[PDB]
From Swiss-Prot:
Source taxonomy: Bacteria, Bacillati, Actinomycetota, Actinomycetes, Mycobacteriales
Gene of this entry: umaA
Alphabetized UniProt keyword annotations: Cytoplasm, Lipid metabolism, Methyltransferase, S-adenosyl-L-methionine, Transferase
Source organism of the structure: Mycobacterium tuberculosis (strain ATCC 25618 / H37Rv)
Binding positions for S-adenosyl-L-methionine per the UniProt entry: 30-31, 65-73, 91-96, 120-121
Highest taxon in the source lineage: Bacteria
Enzyme class of the recorded protein, top EC level: transferase
Name of this chain's protein: S-adenosylmethionine-dependent methyltransferase UmaA
GO MF term list: cyclopropane-fatty-acyl-phospholipid synthase activity
Length: 282
């Protein structure tokens, strides 16, 4: 599929933070929200999702929290505001690195706050607790063991990790559950492969890889229909801001984002995909 002439093309990965602000909530969370109350706004549900993850970590004053894949910094903002802990956030996105650094610098704190442009395989600092929301689905399966081994090694004896990631099912499970994958679903999976690399883990894969690194899985919490609602709102916001999206980028880029959001929404609504928070203990 390689073309003989290099072509500087327009990718969904080239859009600015301003483009994401057309459809994310004000905290710029780009992961599944948690509608703990049915009438929550998107921002309230994103706050609730971060608070849900952080509460599972049993943070105590003075600890250091690592956020692997800190995104646009909403999780660490909640951690700094609500806990008396030092924090380290890592991301490999330069835009997210600068955005999160500037966002968190505005927050009063009596603890240390660091944001780094760094991947987990470069990270060796000892930390007390780890949160990772929406990063694992960008990892290649051949790196899973190394990821859990590194996570285990940087935690203390009492360490805890909250891993939040998207999940798929085996065909046997889908047949059992009465989920019928159609040609249009197949074409959407092909679109994902062409625009987003790799397959998605099943719940059982996370159990297997975590336990092989000597973690215990104490809890899995599944948020399937919360993601369907999250994606619905994102797509509605982007459509409301369609003219501005097209002016910043193009109708092609607008269409690709809308196709992505609404196709993913469908996969959660129909039951092809899920999303889980895994509490891992050492
Ligand atoms: Cl843009």
């Amino acid at each position: 599929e390689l073309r003989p002439f290099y072509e500087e093309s327009q990718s969904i990965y080239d859009v600015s933070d301003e483009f994401f602000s057309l459809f994310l909530d004000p905290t710029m969370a780009y992961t599944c929200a948690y509608f703990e109350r049915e009438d929550m706004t998107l921002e309230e549900a994103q706050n609730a999702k971060f608070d849900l993850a952080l509460d599972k970590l049993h943070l105590e004053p003075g600890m250091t929290l690592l956020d692997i894949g800190c995104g646009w910094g909403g999780g660490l903002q909640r951690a700094i505001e609500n806990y008396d802990v030092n924090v380290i956030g890592i991301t490999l996105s330069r835009n997210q690195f600068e955005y999160s650094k500037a966002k968190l610098a505005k927050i009063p704190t009596e603890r240390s706050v660091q944001v780094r442009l760094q991947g987990w395989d470069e990270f060796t600092d000892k930390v007390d607790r780890i949160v990772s929301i929406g990063a694992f689905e960008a990892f290649k399966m051949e790196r899973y063991a190394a990821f859990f081994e590194r996570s285990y090694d940087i935690l203390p004896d009492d360490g805890r990790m909250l891993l939040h990631t998207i999940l798929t099912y085996t065909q046997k499970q889908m047949h059992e559950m009465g989920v019928k994958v159609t040609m249009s679903d197949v074409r959407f999976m092909k679109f994902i492969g062409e625009e987003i690399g790799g397959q998605l883990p099943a719940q059982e894969d996370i159990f297997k890889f975590a336990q092989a690194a000597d973690f215990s899985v104490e809890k899995v919490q599944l948020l399937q229909q919360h993601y369907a609602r999250t994606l619905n709102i994102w797509a509605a916001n982007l459509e409301a801001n369609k003219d501005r999206a097209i002016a910043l980028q193009s109708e092609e880029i607008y269409n690709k984002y809308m196709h992505y959001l609404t196709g993913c929404e469908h996969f959660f609504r129909k039951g092809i995909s899920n999303v889980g928070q895994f509490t891992l203990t050492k």
